[PDB]
Symmetry: C3
Subunit: 324 residues, 3 copies
């Protein structure tokens, strides 16, 4: 920008028929691309950078840009690189990926990749809606989620979870998902056995508090077995030689889930019209000093009217509880 010229000028411009070999340049015009053109970024893996800079990380397989304060970082942000995962008992997921889980075949385990930066993320989704029968297990190795370093199982059908590194203290956390319930942290197999004869109920070495039961590797519905003290009873009957396991588990809640007391449990006597303030919907039940009753059988009630109708002249100071 001073004295006389350092390098040869080409005022008209210049055309090339083959690749050139250029020690970099400074564009003061437009970069165009005719058809069939092709453009790459420089590979590069260095912490240090100029902001404005762009690169391809052949480590990360991920397009980064150096940023005034964040340094190097996925370009224009990071979303969900979705990918189906063929069923397989342990799979190691990698950051920035979303996994479509086919547990139709049976249960499977997924291991979170070692965390690098606060906010690293993986996504799992019940592609085929089979996690109720055949749960998924999310292992953070030694890294830990929600405190506990332990594994948790996702037991709910068609559930998706984006796990996100919070740092070391708290570890991975779900930041985003659909249809979450009681995450299950399996505690210890209280009973594992293959069955000789068409058994129905078996005795347990200890009194189970909260368990899940696996029949032939599939997990039974809370409906399929009575529980009592330290005997599990099976409705219906279990076939002969049914590989069956009972597992005690702690429950972690990541989802979000009563009765009405009439005049503080004391009545007035000679009354039968139960005008209720809290306006709700269907209500076919109410209790009376312990024993309860069912509506339109011994209790009339229409939402429109809002009040409730009793039968026998309500006894004075009567424990009156109204459901909804």
């Amino acid at each position: 920008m001073a004295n006389k010229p350092t390098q040869p000028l080409f005022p008209m411009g210049l055309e090339t028929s083959e690749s050139s070999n250029i020690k970099g340049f400074n564009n003061s015009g437009t970069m165009e691309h005719s058809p069939g053109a092709v453009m790459t970024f420089p590979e590069d893996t260095e912490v240090t950078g100029l902001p404005s800079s762009v690169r391809y990380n052949p480590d990360s397989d991920e397009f980064e840009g150096y940023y005034e304060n964040g340094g190097w970082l996925s370009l224009g942000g990071g979303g969900i690189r979705w990918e189906t995962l063929p069923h397989a008992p342990s799979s190691n997921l990698l950051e920035g990926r979303g996994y479509l889980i086919n547990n139709t075949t049976g249960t499977s385990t997924v291991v979170l990749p070692s965390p690098t930066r606060i906010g690293d993320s993986v996504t799992i989704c019940d592609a085929y809606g089979k996690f109720a029968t055949y749960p998924l297990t999310v292992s953070p190795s030694g890294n830990n989620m929600y405190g506990s370093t332990e594994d948790m199982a996702i037991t709910t059908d068609n559930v998706s979870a984006t796990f996100t590194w919070s740092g070391p203290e708290q570890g991975w956390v779900i930041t985003s998902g659909v249809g979450l319930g009681q995450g299950r942290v399996y505690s210890r197999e209280i009973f594992t056995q293959i069955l000789a004869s068409e058994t129905s109920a078996v005795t347990l070495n200890t009194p189970p508090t909260i368990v899940d039961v696996y029949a032939d590797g599939k997990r039974l519905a809370e409906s399929k077995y009575s529980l009592d003290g330290n005997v599990i009873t099976f409705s219906p009957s279990l076939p002969a030689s049914t590989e069956l396991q009972v597992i005690e588990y702690t429950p972690i809640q990541l989802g979000n889930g009563i009765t009405w007391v009439y005049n503080g449990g004391s009545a007035i006597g000679g009354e039968t019209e139960i005008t209720l303030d809290i306006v709700v919907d269907d209500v076919p039940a109410i209790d009376i000093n312990g024993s309860r009753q069912y509506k339109n059988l011994g209790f009339t009630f229409d939402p429109l009217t809002s009040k409730i109708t009793l039968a026998q002249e309500l006894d004075a100071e009567d424990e009156v509880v109204v459901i909804i």
Copy 2:
């Protein structure tokens, strides 16, 4: 050494108009300067090379070539957010997120033909009306949760990302908020224009489960009462009211049935002369206990502390009371 085959410019060179270059192999810094302009190549093809980049003129999406996946939006996926002008049906587009305004009324959205696994559309009830005016989501010939059947959302301030699974199971909700009960409408058993004030209607066949629409607005579940095969409306529907009754197969996702438990004290017998019974596992709610069959509520039957886990009863118990403590942990 080796006689070269290309002119060399030891101090580099300068140019004052656009050059026309059959590519080069950059070996240095490649900066720009005020009002310089960069443009990625315009490619649609599928054969690429990792670390390559481009502008998709069919997708309007900047894509890089990935070792693994191949040509994808840079940094995986994006919520292109747009308000959607209210219309009967809208076809929608991969990668975009749509804000739906059903204040006007009912409306339906068609999903894009799927190109890749993980193609994703987002929709939001930005206006809190889906309950009042259900959004239908159509997958066309392609299936959403394992069948081609359209599905309708009916939950105020829903919001949900449909992601493409594979030809097989198909479109599924990868993320979202407020997701309640998805409804896949079955045969429309009853549709008619009421000619007079009507409080009840007779149906050809009794309905297992249905949604009721009056003058194009979904009716609140409370408002309609149904018996064997007769729908009863409180209040009575006004005359010249469009009325449609549709059976639907519910599809559940957001909720995560269970809430209580079945325990017993002292095996099922009454020790006698005990007002404070201790529980073995620490529980979040013990709202009431069952004594022989009737129900005894908190601050009326007893009291309890959920760290102690010790129920404290307001009467001196007796022998063979079938004490059975409810687990309101939920």
Copy 3:
């Protein structure tokens, strides 16, 4: 004539130093060598050309000129995380996800001034203390779910993303977990310092619905009992305790059987009772109030589908049923 107007290099060439170029049009393959560095133009201009890309100096964000959107970030959905060190209030920034530690007391976060539709911030309760020291989201004077009022998250392991939809509705939530019921605090119904340990406290006015805070922490819903205008505490709170009660408006976000016989009556000499249709688990049956449980008055096998009562009934007695799962007849 048909002459060229610019000099032609059939074999291409070689520079050993930075060249200064009024740009080009590439007809070939653009490539780099180890140590090579590449950058994007700087440009704040609204105007652009589809396929144009840039680094926005004020935005501090690589953008591309989209045909429809215009100059928008490449890859759209870009959630940069970062752990917000706790404070009474904190301004948050478009694009950023905040990990929130209400492990001590509560905290308050001030959603940013919006710019385009789709502007978004994500907040996340990574230590599960919202349930005890909740977060209140302030949208300044921008109006959140239809109103300008602050809302408050009480859900424990909660995550939410907020996403501007234009001023009429305003900030609304488009992704999250356990986003249950937002609380919009109203008038502070009770403000006082506990004189001494007290079992219960009489409200100045009866409360429709409220939240209770003791010594900074929010008392759990179960822990306080409310009857009309009288509130009871099990267990009773300690002496010299700071207590507050606020009426609140709940905003719903996530939104997280029955059977009988003999026409609502019975008959006589009924050993058992054939079920209407084969169903799963059969808990208990209501009879003269005191409902008797299974294996304490009756048995039933799903396959058989029959209420095998373990006795015999008499005259004038009502019976209601309860089952488990969904038999779907």
